[PDB]
A paper describes a structure:
Similarly, the two CDX2-DNA structures also displayed very similar overall conformations.
The optimal sequences for HOXB13 are CCAATAAA and CTCGTAAA that differ from each other by the three underlined base pairs, whereas CDX2 binds with high affinity to similar two sequences that begin with a G instead of a C. Two parts of both HOXB13 and CDX2 DBDs interact with DNA: the recognition helix α3, which tightly packs into the major groove, and the N-terminal tail interacting with the minor groove. Instead, thermodynamic analyses of HOXB13, CDX2, BARHL2 and MYF5 revealed that the two optimal states were bound because of their distinct effects on enthalpy and entropy, principally caused by differential stability of the water network at the protein-DNA interface.
Author numbering: 187 to 256
Write the structure that this text describes.
DNA sequence: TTGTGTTTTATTGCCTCC
DNA sequence: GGAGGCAATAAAACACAA
């Protein structure tokens, strides 16, 4: 049935932290993180892709706001 | 509630690396 | 010799007003 799982607040936290460590995850790290977090490598891949899109989207907006002063 | 918007998983399909 | 990137999209989930 399921169309999307919801990730636990723990799982998200680790992933955000790691994302701050580096925007692109290494093959080795990916494998560590998946194993310690109880998700698949694919899910971690994908999550990292989404987070970079979110970041691009937030950055464009930061820019749009900064164009809007003086 | 219901409608209305934004966020979060997950896929698809195309591109680029020698 | 196939991984890894992005964009565009879908739908569940949330948030919350009216």
């Amino acid at each position: 049935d399921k169309y999307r799982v919801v990730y636990t607040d723990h799982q998200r936290l680790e992933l955000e932290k790691e994302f701050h460590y580096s925007r692109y995850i290494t093959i080795r790290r990916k494998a560590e993180l998946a194993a310690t977090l109880g998700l698949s490598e694919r899910q971690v891949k994908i999550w990292f892709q989404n987070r970079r899109a979110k970041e691009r989207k937030i950055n464009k907006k930061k820019l749009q706001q900064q164009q809007q002063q003086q």
